Amino acid sequence: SEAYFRVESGALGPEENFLSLDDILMSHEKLPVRTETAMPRLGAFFNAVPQGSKLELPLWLAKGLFDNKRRILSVELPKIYQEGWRTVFSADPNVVDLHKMGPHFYGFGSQLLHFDSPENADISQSLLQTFIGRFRRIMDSSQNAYNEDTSALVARLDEMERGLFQTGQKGLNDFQCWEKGQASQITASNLVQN
Amino acid sequence: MDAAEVEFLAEKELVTIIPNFSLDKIYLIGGDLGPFNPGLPVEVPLWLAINLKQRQKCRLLPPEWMDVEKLEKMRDHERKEETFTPMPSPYYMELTKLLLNHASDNIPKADEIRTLVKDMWDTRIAKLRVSADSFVRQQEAHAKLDNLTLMEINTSGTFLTQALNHMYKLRTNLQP
Amino acid sequence: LPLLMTNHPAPNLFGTPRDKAEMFRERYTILHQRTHRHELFTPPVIGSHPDESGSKFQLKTIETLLGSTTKIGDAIVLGMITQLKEGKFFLEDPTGTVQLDLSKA
Amino acid sequence: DIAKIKKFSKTRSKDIFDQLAKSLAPSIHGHDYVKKAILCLLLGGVERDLENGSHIRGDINILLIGDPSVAKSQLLRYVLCTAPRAIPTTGRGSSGVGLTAAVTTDQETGERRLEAGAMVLADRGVVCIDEFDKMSDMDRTAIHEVMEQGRVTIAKAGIHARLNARCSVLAAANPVYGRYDQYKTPMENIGLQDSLLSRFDLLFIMLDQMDPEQDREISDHVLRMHRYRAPGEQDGDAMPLGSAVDILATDDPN
Amino acid sequence: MFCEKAMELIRELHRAPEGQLPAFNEDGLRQVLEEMKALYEQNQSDVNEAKSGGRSDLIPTIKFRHCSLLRNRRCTVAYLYDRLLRIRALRWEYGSVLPNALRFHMAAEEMEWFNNYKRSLATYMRSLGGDEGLDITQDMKPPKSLYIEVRCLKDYGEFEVDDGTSVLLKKNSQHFLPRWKCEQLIRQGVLEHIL
Numbered sequence: 001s002e003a004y005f006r007v008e009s010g011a012l013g014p015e016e017n018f019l020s021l022d023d024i025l026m027s028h029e030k031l032p033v034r035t036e037t038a039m040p041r042l043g044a045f046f047n048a049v050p051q052g053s054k055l056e057l058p059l060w061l062a063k064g065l066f067d068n069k070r071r072i073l074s075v076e077l078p079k080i081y082q083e084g085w086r087t088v089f090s091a092d093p094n095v096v097d098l099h100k101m102g103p104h105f106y107g108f109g110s111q112l113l114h115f116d117s118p119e120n121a122d123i124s125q126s127l128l129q130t131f132i133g134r135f136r137r138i139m140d141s142s143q144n145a146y147n148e149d150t151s152a153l154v155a156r157l158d159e160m161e162r163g164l165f166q167t168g169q170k171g172l173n174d175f176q177c178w179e180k181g182q183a184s185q186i187t188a189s190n191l192v193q194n
Numbered sequence: 195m196d197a198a199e200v201e202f203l204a205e206k207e208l209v210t211i212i213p214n215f216s217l218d219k220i221y222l223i224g225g226d227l228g229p230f231n232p233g234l235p236v237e238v239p240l241w242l243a244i245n246l247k248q249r250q251k252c253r254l255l256p257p258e259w260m261d262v263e264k265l266e267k268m269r270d271h272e273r274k275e276e277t278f279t280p281m282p283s284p285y286y287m288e289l290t291k292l293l294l295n296h297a298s299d300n301i302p303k304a305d306e307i308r309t310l311v312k313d314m315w316d317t318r319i320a321k322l323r324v325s326a327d328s329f330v331r332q333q334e335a336h337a338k339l340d341n342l343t344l345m346e347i348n349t350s351g352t353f354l355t356q357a358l359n360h361m362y363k364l365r366t367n368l369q370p
Numbered sequence: 371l372p373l374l375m376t377n378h379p380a381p382n383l384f385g386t387p388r389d390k391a392e393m394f395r396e397r398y399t400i401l402h403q404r405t406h407r408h409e410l411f412t413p414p415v416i417g418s419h420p421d422e423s424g425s426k427f428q429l430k431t432i433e434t435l436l437g438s439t440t441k442i443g444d445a446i447v448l449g450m451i452t453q454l455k456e457g458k459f460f461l462e463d464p465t466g467t468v469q470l471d472l473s474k475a
Numbered sequence: 476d477i478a479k480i481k482k483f484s485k486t487r488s489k490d491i492f493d494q495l496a497k498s499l500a501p502s503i504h505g506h507d508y509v510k511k512a513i514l515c516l517l518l519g520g521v522e523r524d525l526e527n528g529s530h531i532r533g534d535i536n537i538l539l540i541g542d543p544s545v546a547k548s549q550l551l552r553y554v555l556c557t558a559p560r561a562i563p564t565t566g567r568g569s570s571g572v573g574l575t576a577a578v579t580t581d582q583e584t585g586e587r588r589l590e591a592g593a594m595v596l597a598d599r600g601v602v603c604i605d606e607f608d609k610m611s612d613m614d615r616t617a618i619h620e621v622m623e624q625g626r627v628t629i630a631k632a633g634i635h636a637r638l639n640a641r642c643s644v645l646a647a648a649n650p651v652y653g654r655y656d657q658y659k660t661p662m663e664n665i666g667l668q669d670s671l672l673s674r675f676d677l678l679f680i681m682l683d684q685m686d687p688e689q690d691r692e693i694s695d696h697v698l699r700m701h702r703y704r705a706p707g708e709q710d711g712d713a714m715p716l717g718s719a720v721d722i723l724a725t726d727d728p729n
Numbered sequence: 730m731f732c733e734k735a736m737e738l739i740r741e742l743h744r745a746p747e748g749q750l751p752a753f754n755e756d757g758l759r760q761v762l763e764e765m766k767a768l769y770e771q772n773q774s775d776v777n778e779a780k781s782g783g784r785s786d787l788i789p790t791i792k793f794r795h796c797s798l799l800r801n802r803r804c805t806v807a808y809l810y811d812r813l814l815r816i817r818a819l820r821w822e823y824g825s826v827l828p829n830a831l832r833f834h835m836a837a838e839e840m841e842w843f844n845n846y847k848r849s850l851a852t853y854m855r856s857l858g859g860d861e862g863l864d865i866t867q868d869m870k871p872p873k874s875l876y877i878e879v880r881c882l883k884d885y886g887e888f889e890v891d892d893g894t895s896v897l898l899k900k901n902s903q904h905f906l907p908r909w910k911c912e913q914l915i916r917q918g919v920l921e922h923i924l
């Protein structure tokens with residue numbers, strides 16, 4: 001029915017959604033870079049920022065400054081997307097804590113491909129295989145954790161996987177309410193709290 | 195789509211009732227029904243059957259497939275097969291819930307019928323779980339689910355479709 | 371906020387001991403929010419390449435200067451004039467009080 | 476557990492000892508000379524062997540004496556976190572046996588052997604002793620040999636041996652009467668015996684002097700530290716109680 | 730970094746997934762707009778300096794402030810639009826006249842938008858048929874029974890059932906009435922559907 005629905009996240013696509021709060025928060029996360037030419041007047045922030053300076057700045061700003069000729073700055077991957085952590089994911093995707101390793105792991109990784117790194121293919125394959133490995137546990141936990149504390153199950157999941165978990169939980173709760181007949185009652189909305 | 199809406203579609207299925215009242219043919223928009231003669235079977239949609247049973251105006255008769263022998267055969271066939279088998283009704287779970295919750299007095303051996311329907315439901319939801327896992331593991335592009343019912347698809351399909359959307363975008367993010 | 375949207379009680383003649391202080395506290399509050407919206411406010415993010423002291427009108431309260439700021443030559447404070455001792459004037463704000471040497475005005 | 480960048484950084488930096496000392500324990504404000512002394516303790520001198528066969532002990536021993544709430548325990552904790560092979564110890568929770576060595580039965584065979592104590596485990600390392608003024612005298616008898624000679628002599632079970640206990644001692648104590656008394660001599664504020672005090676390289680008295688400017692900067696630093704939250708943590712998280720989080724035999728961000 | 734005040738608007742809305750409407754962050758909106766004004770003034774000064782003087786090294790920081798400005802715009806527009814989404818859900822989940830405790834959270838322009846949306850929606854609903862339209866805000870759940878039993882939660886005034894017939898909605902009184910007449914009051918919480 002006509003319930004409130006957030007603007008959906010478009011982080012996994014070629015470009016993120018403009019009005020998505022999730023995409024905005026995802027792109028806020030910082031990204032290491034190396035500056036290719038000195039920038040005047042910005043020494044107050046990191047008077048000129050000298051050439052060759054290492055910086056960590058937001059992903060939206062890195063994408064804004066980044067032109068494919070690599071004229072202003074060079075963009076480097078975060079550690080969690082480099083080969084060692086990709087190997088960690090290859091070991092067993094179920095045990096890594098993607099909530100602590102950036103809450104928007106898949107969205108940040110997908111937008112990290114925009115900079116045309118030589119290991120873009122490796123990053124993409126790592127993201128795909130991580131999702132494939134974690135899918136079954138997400139599915140079973142979401143669809144079988146009925147009416148209990150879901151904190152331990154949902155703790156290690158990134159925000160995309162948390163959305164999938166809530167979708168599965170919503171389906172489970174809907175079917176259980178149907179089977180026990182509670183779905184037939186007409187009830188006041190959540191706004192009765194006011 | 196909600197389970198109540200799947201029940202709403204399931205309520206269109208035809209069942210047989212024995213009225214205890216007299217009423218000539220009534221011309222409904224979806225199709226005329228009746229005449230309703232006392233003590234004689236007449237076929238009506240399930241919503242009207244449940245409403246008349248609630249109002250003490252009829253006795254519901256079970257469908258031909260609500261039979262312990264037939265349901266045991268169907269359950270054993272479902273457990274024996276790997277693919278989803280053809281079900282006796284396209285809304286068998288909702289039919290079972292409505293008819294047994296409202297007319298357990300009319301329907302004999304309702305406990306056995308309910309338990310066998312639950313067995314079939316558990317087996318087929320397990321098969322659907324296996325199908326979803328195989329889909330994601332093998333990175334299939336499409337699946338074939340010929341004999342699934344609408345309630346079975348609705349129970350798990352929102353999660354599965356969202357997960358497959360995410361998987362598709364993850365495996366296609368190198369398009370240039 | 372109107373009082374119906376708050377915890378504030380209705381006004382009455384036989385006020386509480388709190389209300390007597392609340393008069394002057396609210397007078398300070400209105401003048402304080404009036405004051406900080408004037409051009410004396412601090413510059414925006416690198417509004418000037420060297421930093422500026424709020425258009426040379428940067429503000430402070432009494433409790434801030436009761437401390438390390440001895441003989442700081444540019445203190446500005448909003449507060450109420452009081453002859454808290456005879457001839458020995460004091461300033462007061464909701465944070466505290468301090469003597470006023472007003473030999474030059 | 477590369478050196479070339481260190482040997483370049485010592486040229487790029489100007490008086491790198493000062494920068495290291497300032498950066499020693501960021502969470503603790505002030506105490507600059509104490510931080511320099513702790514850095515000296517961490518680095519140490521060079522132990523001499525003389526041609527006559529005598530040796531000169533190279534470790535540096537530091538004793539911090541001071542009022543309640545002047546970060547002595549916190550400096551010990553930082554040294555425990557930063558140094559390789561730093562052993563924690565507290566005065567009331569330790570014994571002369573546990574500091575040096577204990578006879579214990581090896582259940583693989585049943586024979587009894589020496590099991591190393593704190594200062595033997597700390598060999599070529601550091602041992603941090605909090606509440607040092609609360610130790611028993613018989614327990615400090617063990618510390619005397621360790622500090623004086625860099626060894627401990629043991630004669631128990633079947634074994635008679637001089638165990639190596641070459642460790643720097645970083646001890647923390649309160650003065651007698653809890654709070655330091657300005658109207659008493661230091662030798663009476665300090666309840667320890669002069670024989671023991673001779674074994675420490677440096678002795679620091681640090682006081683809770685309630686200067687308003689010093690209080691201003693200290694309180695500002697403390698409240699800034701309490702306001703800090705890590706970047707890999709959500710805006711309203713309580714930190715999780717401990718659980719295993721290491722998932723490769725070698726560290727990944729390298 | 731510049732953007733953090735804009736991020737507080739975003740974090741305010743993201744910290745309430747349930748769809749309820751927080752108070753309008755007028756002060757935060759004023760601050761991000763002031764920041765954009767300052768950024769634009771600096772950018773204009775720098776860009777005209779660079780173009781008139783022929784000085785080329787300004788162009789990276791020009792692009793820096795330009796991207797920062799576009800970021801500020803994106804954040805505030807997303808904030809306003811998501812607030813509009815939350816407000817739009819109120820017409821369907823509760824009804825037309827919002828309670829004053831919630832109406833106090835809305836901006837005046839938000840109430841303007843909401844009134845325009847209500848007028849447009851009512852116009853669309855009227856135009857669905859020859860006379861009286863179709864009230865699609867009703868029939869939110871599939872129908873089970875023609876009549877329902879309802880219980881009065883709020884002590885409430887006279888409620889017309891049909892013309893001269895009406896029922897007094899005194900608290901704890903219990904009526905048996907048509908579902909389509911009782912649906913709005915149940916959704917508003919005046920009545921409790923039982924059984």
Ligand SMILES: Nc1ncnc2c1ncn2[C@@H]1O[C@H](COP(=O)(O)OP(=O)(O)NP(=O)(O)O)[C@@H](O)[C@H]1O
Nearest residue numbers: 502503504505542543544545546547548549649697
């Ligand atoms: N200069 C300082 N900077 C930061 N925190 C400080 C400072 N001085 C004291 N504290 C805090 O005070 C608390 C107590 O520190 P602690 O190390 O136990 O003091 P102490 O000198 O050992 N006193 P005590 O254990 O009673 O002999 C800790 O939380 C410290 O962080």
Ligand SMILES: [Mg+2]
Nearest residue numbers: 546547548549
């Ligand atoms: Mg301490």
